Design a protein around this ligand. Structure first.
Ligand code: NDG
Ligand code: CL
Ligand code: CL
Ligand code: CL
Ligand code: CL
Ligand code: CL
Ligand code: NA
Length: 129
């Protein structure tokens, strides 16, 4: 599923991301826009053989099991396929564990390089929330 901006903001808010560990909703929407272009079906293979899955491009090296990342962890205790659902619950519940891990949203390279220190509120401007 390809989310609209305001549609994803409302879904993230419903699932408890707005100000989760101090990160305003705009941060999460901005991160999804630059990680996946709001596409729940987004996959990208890393140089190390790990793969990033879903709207927040969560990595099989640490967070989910795809059966093809030797020596990796499954810290969210989910198959990576669950992160590709039209329903964002699995991606949101895993995002909560990641952002609590000590490095906050710096775990999302696109957030660090394209969202961090920007006017992230623009991503939820005009939305019914
Ligand atoms: C929290 C999370 O899994 N972030 C991943 C990161 O590990 C990976 O390196 C990158 C791919 O380049 O996409 C995402 O930002
Ligand atoms: Cl947009
Ligand atoms: Cl915001
Ligand atoms: Cl594996
Ligand atoms: Cl949803
Ligand atoms: Cl933080
Ligand atoms: Na894994």
């Amino acid at each position: 599923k390809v989310f609209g901006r305001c549609e994803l903001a409302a879904a993230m808010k419903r699932h408890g991301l707005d100000n989760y560990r101090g990160y305003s909703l705009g941060n999460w929407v901005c991160a999804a826009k630059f990680e996946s272009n709001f596409n729940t079906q987004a996959t990208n293979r890393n140089t190390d053989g790990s793969t990033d899955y879903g709207i927040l491009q969560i990595n099989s090296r640490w967070w989910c099991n795809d059966g093809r990342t030797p020596g990796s962890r499954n810290l969210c205790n989910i198959p990576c396929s669950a992160l590709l659902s039209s329903d964002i619950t699995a991606s949101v519940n895993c995002a909560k564990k990641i952002v609590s891990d000590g490095n906050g949203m710096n775990a999302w390279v696109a957030w660090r390089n394209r969202c961090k220190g920007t006017d992230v509120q623009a991503w939820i401007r005009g939305c019914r929330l």
